[PDB]
Amino acid sequence: TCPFYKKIPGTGFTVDAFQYGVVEGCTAYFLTHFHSDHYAGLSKHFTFPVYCSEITGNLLKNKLHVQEQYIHPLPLDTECIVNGVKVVLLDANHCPGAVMILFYLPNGTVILHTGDFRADPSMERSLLADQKVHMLYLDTTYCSPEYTFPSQQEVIRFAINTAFEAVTLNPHALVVCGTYSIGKEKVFLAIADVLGSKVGMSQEKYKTLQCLNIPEINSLITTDMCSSLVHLLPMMQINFKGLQSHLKKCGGKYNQILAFRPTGWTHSNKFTRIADVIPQTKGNISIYGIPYSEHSSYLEMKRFVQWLKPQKIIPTVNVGTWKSRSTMEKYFREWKLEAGY
Ligand SMILES: c1cnc(Oc2ccc(-c3cc[nH]n3)cc2)nc1
Ligand code: NI
């Protein structure tokens, strides 16, 4: 049963709704981005029109084997008519290929669906500036004031400086970075760039990255692990046992591992500054948890919503408990009373 918050009223459209079988009345299925909770259910046997970005379409074709005849990529920042309704895709500042969707309903209502996003002041000078938005379907992942974290730029500065120091002190150190999905590519790319190395990875992860339209990508990644001193591993392997095991496989080329786990928020954020972050260490292995987020902080979310001034907000995350729903509704009312809309 497809829930109300995945349906767009007055249209034949759903958003991120592939796990409910054939949805009654749905003539077009939109996919905001290629993360598994959102694409859940898509396969080579899907036979309805899918609307998405070019990058999401590349991943659908090559990783999930969806047939080409059902993939409808749309350019960004461009008015398009889909099944009689004007739509626009906007960059969501999430992972590669992630979009927000503006729907211009036949009755004059305007709806923004953020998908997953990290709100930024630059969005205040997109096509959103042009008209009133009545309803907002909002990524509320971190909708509580305790959820603080630094800018992406500050976190990358820390990672580059940490890696460069360690490898200049010990040229036989290996750097490892954890991954379990697309997104957060800047972490491993920025480290490899400062060290003058390509990033080594599995054939499966290499395939995924080859779909993302990153400029000059062939100069930056490889499947030849032996040529590279920055390796990507599954997030599950970023622990002392898993890293010990990996070091054994490198044939005495290295004698130290420096590893990074890019999480989102962790309550380490409440006390500590990014500058003061320290690793967990056992022998010749050190692991840094770094707060690299691709979702809005509380303050970023609040600024975006107070600028947009929507008439109604529909959360799309943390919808399952009465406590979560009541907490979010209280913040939305605070924001409205403070700003006067
Ligand atoms: C050397 C090379 N590349 C980087 O970083 C990135 C470059 C491009 C993307 C990207 C994602 C979607 N479109 N472009 C992301 C990260 N850093 C150093
Ligand atoms: Ni996501």
From Swiss-Prot:
Keywords, comma-separated and alphabetical: Cell cycle, Cell division, DNA damage, DNA repair, Hydrolase, Isopeptide bond, Metal-binding, Mitosis, Nucleus, Phosphoprotein, Ubl conjugation, Zinc, Zinc-finger
UniProt KW rRNA-binding keyword: no
One MF annotation (Gene Ontology) recorded for this entry: zinc ion binding
Subcellular location: Nucleus
Assigned GO CC terms: fibrillar center; nucleoplasm
Subunit (UniProt): Binds constitutively to TP53BP1. Binds CDC27, which is itself a component of the anaphase promoting complex (APC). Binds PIAS1.
Name of the protein: DNA cross-link repair 1A protein
Organism: Homo sapiens
Section covered of the full-length record: 700 to 1040 of 1040
